[PDB]
Design a protein around this ligand. Structure first.
Ligand SMILES: C[C@@H]1C[C@@H]([C@H](O)CC2CC(=O)NC(=O)C2)C(=O)[C@@H](C)C1
Ligand SMILES: [Mg+2]
Ligand SMILES: [Mg+2]
Ligand SMILES: [Mg+2]
Ligand SMILES: [Mg+2]
Ligand SMILES: [Mg+2]
Ligand SMILES: [Mg+2]
Ligand SMILES: [Mg+2]
Ligand SMILES: [Mg+2]
Ligand SMILES: [Mg+2]
Ligand SMILES: [Mg+2]
Ligand SMILES: [Mg+2]
Ligand SMILES: [Mg+2]
Ligand SMILES: [Mg+2]
Ligand SMILES: [Mg+2]
Ligand SMILES: [Mg+2]
Ligand SMILES: [Mg+2]
Ligand SMILES: [Mg+2]
Ligand SMILES: [Mg+2]
Ligand SMILES: [Mg+2]
Ligand SMILES: [Mg+2]
Ligand SMILES: [Mg+2]
Ligand SMILES: [Mg+2]
Ligand SMILES: [Mg+2]
Ligand SMILES: [Mg+2]
Ligand SMILES: [Mg+2]
Ligand SMILES: [Mg+2]
Ligand SMILES: [Mg+2]
Ligand SMILES: [Mg+2]
Ligand SMILES: [Mg+2]
Ligand SMILES: [Mg+2]
Ligand SMILES: [Mg+2]
Ligand SMILES: [Mg+2]
Ligand SMILES: [Mg+2]
Ligand SMILES: [Mg+2]
Ligand SMILES: [Mg+2]
Ligand SMILES: [Mg+2]
Ligand SMILES: [Mg+2]
Ligand SMILES: [Mg+2]
Ligand SMILES: [Mg+2]
Ligand SMILES: [Mg+2]
Ligand SMILES: [Mg+2]
Ligand SMILES: [Mg+2]
Ligand SMILES: [Mg+2]
Ligand SMILES: [Mg+2]
Ligand SMILES: [Mg+2]
Ligand SMILES: [Mg+2]
Ligand SMILES: [Mg+2]
Ligand SMILES: [Mg+2]
Ligand SMILES: [Mg+2]
Ligand SMILES: [Mg+2]
Ligand SMILES: [Mg+2]
Ligand SMILES: [Mg+2]
Ligand SMILES: [Mg+2]
Ligand SMILES: [Mg+2]
Ligand SMILES: [Mg+2]
Ligand SMILES: [Mg+2]
Ligand SMILES: [Mg+2]
Ligand SMILES: [Mg+2]
Ligand SMILES: [Mg+2]
Ligand SMILES: [Mg+2]
Ligand SMILES: [Mg+2]
Ligand SMILES: [Mg+2]
Ligand SMILES: [Mg+2]
Ligand SMILES: [Mg+2]
Ligand SMILES: [Mg+2]
Ligand SMILES: [Zn+2]
Lengths: 50, 98, 251
RNA sequence: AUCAGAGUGGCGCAGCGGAAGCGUGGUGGGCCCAUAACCCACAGGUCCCAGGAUCGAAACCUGGCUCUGAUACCA
RNA sequence: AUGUAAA
RNA sequence: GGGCGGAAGACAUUGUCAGGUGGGGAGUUUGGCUGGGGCGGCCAAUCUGUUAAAAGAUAACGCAGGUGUCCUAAGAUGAGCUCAACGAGAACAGAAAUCUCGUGUGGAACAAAAGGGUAAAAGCUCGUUUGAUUCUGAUUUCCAGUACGAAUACGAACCGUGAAAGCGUGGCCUAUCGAUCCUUUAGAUCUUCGGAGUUUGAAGCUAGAGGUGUCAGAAAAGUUACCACAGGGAUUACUGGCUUGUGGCAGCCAAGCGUUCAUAGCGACGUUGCUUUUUGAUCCUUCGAUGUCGGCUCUUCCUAUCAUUGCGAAGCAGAAUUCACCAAGUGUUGGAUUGUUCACCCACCAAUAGGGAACGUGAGCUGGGUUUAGACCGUCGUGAGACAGGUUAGUUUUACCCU
RNA sequence: CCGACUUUGUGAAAUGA
RNA sequence: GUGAUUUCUGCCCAGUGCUCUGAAUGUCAAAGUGAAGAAAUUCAACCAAGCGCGGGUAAACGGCGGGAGUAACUAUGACUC
RNA sequence: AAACUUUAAAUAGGUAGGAUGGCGCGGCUGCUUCGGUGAGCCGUGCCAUGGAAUCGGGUGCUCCAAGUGGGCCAUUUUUGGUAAGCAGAACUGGCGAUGCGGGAUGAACCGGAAGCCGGGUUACGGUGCCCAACUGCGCGCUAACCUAGAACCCACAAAGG
RNA sequence: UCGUUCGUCUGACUUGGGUAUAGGGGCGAAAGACUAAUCGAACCAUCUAGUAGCUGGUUCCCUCCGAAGUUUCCCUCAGGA
RNA sequence: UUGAAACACGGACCAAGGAGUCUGACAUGCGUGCGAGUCGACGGGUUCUGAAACCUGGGAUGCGCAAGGAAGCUGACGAGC
């Protein structure tokens, strides 16, 4: 009758049955959000390669 | 809460683009116009029978209002407005703390 | 809520006047040349009891002024008329009890009954049992007159209006206690269905504003506005005061 | 049992931090032969008990005490 | 407003 | 004499708008949580410490408390100083006024709650100031890895301060706040009014405010005992169940009472248990109905024994009375008043013990109470109405089935 | 309930323009 | 509304309601008037009843208090604040 | 001493254990430095015995969608309560969704998870009868004139003699 | 409804026929009574297969895979995303 | 329903009727035709059992091939690891 319910019961069991999904390790880890001062320069340097 | 009559702040008008010298006023809502779309819609909807059509607000719960300062810089005479935090006692250029 | 007893009376279904054994309207003669410029002799034939009304009614047999037949008129009895009496109708009829005269012929202080209001409306004031009006003054520059009515109200009336000299008979009728639900019932049977009357405080809210409550009480002010909608104008309509009257308040 | 309200001069009561009064009562004169009454002066209080903040408390918050007033219903 | 019981 | 006779008369009145009144009437609402609901409160937004079990997460109407603000300085920066307290001292000066020196790890202060943090400072004083600014992104916290609030780190501008490095995107950090639509303001010498222009107005774009505290944000009072429908044993009142605080019962030790004497008979301070007739707690069965108090009737069982049979002990001389033992076979009454269980009197008695059996027992009775609709009083409510206030009247259905 | 317009025409005076 | 008869119906007009009075310089609509405007429109004055302000009304709805001390036995408290 | 702490466990927590590494050479940078000084990248060439143990194909990527969102029991930690077959939490498992063998009977206690059959051997539990298995081989303790005592949960008994 | 026992019985009396009042209406000596076994809003048809977060039911076999009572928000707690 | 043989509710028995269908929009998945196209769906001509079938238009009807803005408007200059 107590309308408020909250348990962590069964929660690890549900979590671990599709595994703890680690996202795929990627070559060229993303540069989103890095220092734009550094990113501008890196983009210019890739612009002027030979 | 006290605000100086005049403050040095940024002016985004293309011809100032720098901290210039701004007067201070206090924002007061302009009186509601009778030709706004919301009013020639509310009046029309309200005409006839059916009574009150748009809700009317009753449960007022706040007790303060966010003051808006209309800073006018005297280098281009263009206002720009900044909101200060909620306050009850508010005064521009009041006698300073002793 | 539902329609109140006081609203229900406007249809007449069970509230019309019980008018089966009444003897017709009680009123004067048609005002005409003779009754305006002279007098007409009528002989009173019988004083009949009119059911539903407190006053006796005097049947009077005139002769038709311009065609050969009688006229049985029926007057309201003024105290004193007896069968065989000659009642005179017109302007220059002498001032005696039972005669009917215009107010231009009745001196100040005269006691009259069955007064007209618009000259020729055939007598409307001072008709109930034992009621009279006292003719107070005459204005001959207007051709008008003043009278004190049974209510004490003082009215200006045209001076050419007729009026029966005397007072209505049956005086003091209401002086007798009835002592009985019986006498009350037989009084109101021949008048109309307005008896018995149930206290609204002993009703249910759906039919009366006073009804309801664990105890019997009105609940709010018993006096209502003049403009209250019908079905709410119930109680003391537009009262100017209340409470037992003392002193000048009863004048 | 909960929830309010109030604890201030001897009694009943006013009080908005600088901070204590009102009537009356008491004390000393005065009038009277004497007592009132009346006139003129005089002295007041642990601001319920214990803390804190506050320039600044009796007031502000809290804990403890005592009285009063409410609400304690459908079975 | 008033006036020892103590003779 | 072309006026039927009077009265009022361009006022009443008729129609359309306009404002006020209008439970007479219509339509509708009258939040949520909740150890049933109602009243109370906010555990609905939200912060600190704990519970929280040494990563994170973590609940209850758990605990101790806080928030709807305050601030042109109590924000930014720089510089100088060190704080509370103690010790010795100096006219009036005392426990306490002002000054000086010594010690001083923070025992002070930092707007506030509590925690954390800070000492040539994040505190105190002083100088100068407005980074409490502009543009849009990114991340963290809650998170579904949405929003909001708050915070953090860069970027592009413009500035404050310092000599400079730097520090500064409000408050030393953790809470102190807000959607859609509408209105209103700021900005571009911006866009549209769709036949083309001038020209008011209006409509836009970007960024703020007007506020929703039920705080991811309807516009909203009661009553029903005349009530109704859907349902609920997710949820109350009767019985039952676990528990036994509470009610009842009985042990242990022995300070004393018992004129001397702890234990004949009690046994305080303590302490251990038993019981399910009370009351409390819970909410497990039962709300497509288990017929609800009491009494009458009648039966059965329990012993925690009142008499009755047999005994032991005494502060048992006899008589009577008290304590205990084996003992439930037998008995435990007539009445006043109350519906009462209970109570309390009168009297008898050998005795007028306690209890259980779905608080035994309504297709066994009664219907006094309670518990519909009538009605009255009182208190309450403005009113409908309410009362775990009082009073009166109020339908008690079926067995023939199985056992 | 009262206000205005309407049926609502005629001429006369006194105060405002 | 109360309920034959007898006897009597005490105080309160602050509250709610009802009603009465309108000097006018409170508030107060549509109409109607003036001004600004190129016009829409805005602004002003004027502005009825209603409300407000002012009186009456309780056989109108209703309501009708506390705390202390005091008598020469004690008790109470006629009395006093 | 839960809202005290200097110290400080166990259990659990995070990260790393290579082929997505390293070095050399010459090129770019609008960043960065007093500066080839760095930081990063680009082209090229070389090396890198697989860099603890054990185990194994993977949500690895995506789409569409069902039902569910009333839970309960147990051992340990644990809040309120006197306690509760009570209310609320933590890690885990069970029941629900589950039969089967044992605990006499019981949803969650013990063993154990299952296609249908034959054979063998077991787990828990027992071997007096009910009831398949010994009145088996040993050693003591108990004598109950109270229903002696006799199964993890469990169906309880204490203080004291 | 039946039996006995009761109330009134010259009266506000008992009653037949005619006639009037019809649903938010009637009528009520007032019980929310009566209005055709229906009344705190009759009955008949229609809108109508009203709506329902609630109760009940929901039809053949085998094989294979096979859970949840937990987060967040909601006038949200018997519900839905 | 956490939990049913339950003292939870429905079921006396039989037979027949009896409950996720139709339509619109959308979407994923799958099959077919064509494929920068693709649809002939409203009409027209035919149609010797025919409401069928077959033919016809389309040079712009629907969707798709261009998107970003509120709007005026502008509208992809050709990719490396
Ligand atoms: C006084 C105004 C009231 C309110 C607004 O007008 C109510 C609207 C908003 C809404 O929810 N939809 C509506 O139709 C009503 C608002 O915005 C506040 C800021 C201030
Ligand atoms: Mg739940
Ligand atoms: Mg707008
Ligand atoms: Mg219109
Ligand atoms: Mg209108
Ligand atoms: Mg009648
Ligand atoms: Mg009468
Ligand atoms: Mg009457
Ligand atoms: Mg009544
Ligand atoms: Mg009414
Ligand atoms: Mg009433
Ligand atoms: Mg003196
Ligand atoms: Mg004297
Ligand atoms: Mg005297
Ligand atoms: Mg209504
Ligand atoms: Mg609720
Ligand atoms: Mg409760
Ligand atoms: Mg841990
Ligand atoms: Mg932790
Ligand atoms: Mg410094
Ligand atoms: Mg965010
Ligand atoms: Mg910076
Ligand atoms: Mg600071
Ligand atoms: Mg900060
Ligand atoms: Mg906003
Ligand atoms: Mg146009
Ligand atoms: Mg919310
Ligand atoms: Mg209602
Ligand atoms: Mg009733
Ligand atoms: Mg007990
Ligand atoms: Mg006890
Ligand atoms: Mg239950
Ligand atoms: Mg039930
Ligand atoms: Mg049943
Ligand atoms: Mg039964
Ligand atoms: Mg039954
Ligand atoms: Mg015994
Ligand atoms: Mg029975
Ligand atoms: Mg009864
Ligand atoms: Mg009743
Ligand atoms: Mg009352
Ligand atoms: Mg009662
Ligand atoms: Mg009741
Ligand atoms: Mg009566
Ligand atoms: Mg009054
Ligand atoms: Mg009054
Ligand atoms: Mg106007
Ligand atoms: Mg006026
Ligand atoms: Mg480790
Ligand atoms: Mg289930
Ligand atoms: Mg086998
Ligand atoms: Mg055998
Ligand atoms: Mg009979
Ligand atoms: Mg008849
Ligand atoms: Mg008849
Ligand atoms: Mg009937
Ligand atoms: Mg259907
Ligand atoms: Mg239906
Ligand atoms: Mg259900
Ligand atoms: Mg769902
Ligand atoms: Mg259940
Ligand atoms: Mg059962
Ligand atoms: Mg059911
Ligand atoms: Mg059945
Ligand atoms: Mg095409
Ligand atoms: Mg490639
Ligand atoms: Zn400027």
């Amino acid at each position: 009758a107590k309308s408020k319910n909250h348990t962590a019961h069964n929660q690890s069991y549900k979590a671990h049955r599709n595994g703890i999904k680690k996202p795929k390790r990627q070559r060229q880890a993303s540069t989103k959000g890095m220092d734009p001062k550094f990113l501008r320069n890196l983009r210019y340097s890739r612009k002027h390669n030979v | 809460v006290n605000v100086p009559k005049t403050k040095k702040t940024y002016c985004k008008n293309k011809e100032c683009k720098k901290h210039t010298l701004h007067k201070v006023t206090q924002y007061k809502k302009g009186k509601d116009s009778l030709s706004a779309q919301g009013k020639r819609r509310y009046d029309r909807k309200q005409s006839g029978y059916g009574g009150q059509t748009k809700p009317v607000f009753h449960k007022k719960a706040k007790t303060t209002k966010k003051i808006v300062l209309k800073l006018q810089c005297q280098s281009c005479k263009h206002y720009s407005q900044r909101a200060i935090k909620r306050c009850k006692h508010f005064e521009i250029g009041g006698d300073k703390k002793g | 809520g539902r329609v109140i007893r006081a609203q229900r009376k406007g249809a007449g279904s069970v509230f019309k006047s019980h008018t089966h054994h009444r003897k017709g309207p009680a009123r004067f003669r048609s005002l005409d040349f003779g009754e305006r410029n002279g007098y007409l002799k009528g002989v009173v034939t019988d004083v009949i009891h009119d059911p539903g009304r407190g006053a006796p009614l005097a049947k009077v047999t005139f002769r038709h002024p311009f065609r050969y037949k009688h006229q049985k008129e029926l007057f309201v009895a003024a105290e004193g008329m007896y069968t065989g009496q000659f009642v005179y109708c017109g302007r220059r009829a002498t001032l005696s009890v039972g005669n009917v005269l215009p107010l231009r012929s009745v001196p100040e202080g005269g006691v009259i009954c069955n007064v007209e209001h618009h000259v020729g409306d055939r007598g409307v004031f001072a008709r109930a049992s034992g009621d009279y009006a006292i003719v107070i003054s005459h204005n001959p520059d207007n051709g008008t007159s003043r009278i004190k009515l049974p209510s004490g109200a003082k009215k200006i009336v045209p001076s050419s209006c007729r009026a029966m000299i005397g007072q209505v008979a049956g005086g003091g009728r209401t002086e007798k206690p009835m002592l009985k639900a019986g006498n009350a019932y037989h009084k109101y049977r021949v008048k109309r269905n307005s008896w018995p009357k149930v206290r609204g405080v002993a009703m249910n809210p759906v039919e009366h504003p006073h009804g309801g409550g664990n105890h019997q009480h009105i609940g709010h002010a018993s006096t209502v506005r003049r403009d209250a909608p019908p079905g709410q104008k119930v109680g003391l309509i537009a009262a100017r005061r209340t409470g037992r009257l003392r002193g000048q308040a009863a004048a």
